[PDB]
From a paper:
Lipases are enzymes that reversibly catalyze the hydrolysis and synthesis of a large variety of glycerol esters. A minimal lid domain comprising the residues 141-183 is inserted between strand β6 and helix αE on top of the CD active-site area. Different from most other lipases, in which the lid is generally formed by a bundle of α-helices, in Tth MAG lipase this domain is compact. It is formed by two small α-helices, followed by a β-hairpin and an additional α-helix, referred to as α-helix/β-hairpin/α-helix (HBH).
To rule out that the presence of glycerol in the Tth MAG lipase structure is due to the addition of glycerol in the cryo-protectant buffer, we determined an additional Tth MAG lipase structure without using glycerol in any sample preparation step and cryo-protection prior to X-ray data collection. In this structure, glycerol is found in a literally identical active site position in five out of six protein chains of the respective asymmetric unit, confirming its origin to be independent from a specific crystallization and cryo-protection protocol.
Numbering used by the authors:
A (entry chain A), B (entry chain B): 1 to 259
The structure:
Amino acid sequence: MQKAVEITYNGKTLRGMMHLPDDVKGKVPMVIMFHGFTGNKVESHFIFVKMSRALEKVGIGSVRFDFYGSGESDGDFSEMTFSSELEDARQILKFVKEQPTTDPERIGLLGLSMGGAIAGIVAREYKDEIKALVLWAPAFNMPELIMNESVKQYGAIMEQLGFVDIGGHKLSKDFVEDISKLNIFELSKGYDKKVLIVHGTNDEAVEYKVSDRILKEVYGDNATRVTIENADHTFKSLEWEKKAIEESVEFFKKELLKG
Amino acid sequence: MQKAVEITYNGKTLRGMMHLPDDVKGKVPMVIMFHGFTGNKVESHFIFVKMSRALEKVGIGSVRFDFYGSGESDGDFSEMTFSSELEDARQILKFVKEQPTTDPERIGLLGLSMGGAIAGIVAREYKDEIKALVLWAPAFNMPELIMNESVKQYGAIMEQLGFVDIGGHKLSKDFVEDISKLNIFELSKGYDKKVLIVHGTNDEAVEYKVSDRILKEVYGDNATRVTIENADHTFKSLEWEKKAIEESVEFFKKELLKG
Ligand SMILES: CCCCCCCCCC
């Protein structure tokens, strides 16, 4: 089953999609999915929609919302900061916990790229009530990526206009100010439940090396990695996305439907 | 106001969004928006969403749905053909005409890229009940574009396995066969009401020359062209998308709110 949903808080409306399995009644595991920077709840080549459908077939529900300033949700992209998306995510978790079909002890988080950074942070903040975590090419070095640009052209453009054009999106100076103060690696450290990282070797947006840091610096033996050979950042082929979705579904089926 | 909407016909469910202006009540002009090949109802850098919001402010509502096989709607991409998207468009027009806030004589069509080809055809099929037409880089040469793509890129796999991977999407042989039988220029010819074409000069997906053909071969003096200098296919900058949205909003404001 697929139904559209909304959240309204602080005068902000988030719009999303909720998937519940047709077969099983009662309370079910739920996966919350976080899209990345300039992405949206559907994500690249619909990989999020696919994931939800692949999950409901194993009796796992899911919700996917567009962050404020993106896609179907209200707001201008210029109003968005990483911290504001964090607050959106805290409200989304609250919404999932309020649904009468949600099993409170079976809630997982999934995040792609910058959504992986968010998912990491949220996982830590609620480490005792988030059952499992999947990270897809998680952009934990996002602060560093924004910082390096200070000496390049986007830095000079930001210094002059207070915003930059990243391809039909207005990236505010407020985002640079906000993100410069955060260390995703440290803010994600301390999550003890099982973690799955899926990463491509040819990822030219978040290099594969980043995942090594996460394995070394953020988690212990509870974290494991699926390497998708030859894959680009968003797993943009049928075989690459099939591998990502199947490994992640099996991880959530093992980790959420056991407890 | 923005609300999620659905259509179900012949065992298929389409999912979309409906925008109505808050201040004006009664029947209002309505714009139907058609996304392009591998796109979705939000479209590139949220330009469709923005276009809907810009329309609300001038008292024009809108609907944007994902075609069957894309985005939030049902179905796999392999099930989609150009003709199935035409049938979806006919059902979406039907849906708009059933809404009690729709002024039946004030319905306009907008299409981007392959969706513009959709709009061009639908406008002709309903030439007496479609009040105005906007085409954004309309891909009337889509049969030729796909034919060139098979000959140079797809290859034997299409014959051996029946499909090709176009970037996380399974493009079926049926689409190639179906689209080869259609002439978008001929099927759109005969629409007499006002038409706006917006096109970028550096468009590398649908060459600017195509718009020249549409002005000469498809429409008469009822058609007008806004050229956006240096712009790419989806007008992917703040300046380019502002120009496209404002020109289209003022065109729909003049042509739907008159007569
Ligand atoms: C991976 C991030 C791509 C966009 C970065 C833009 C940097 C702006 C700095 C002023």
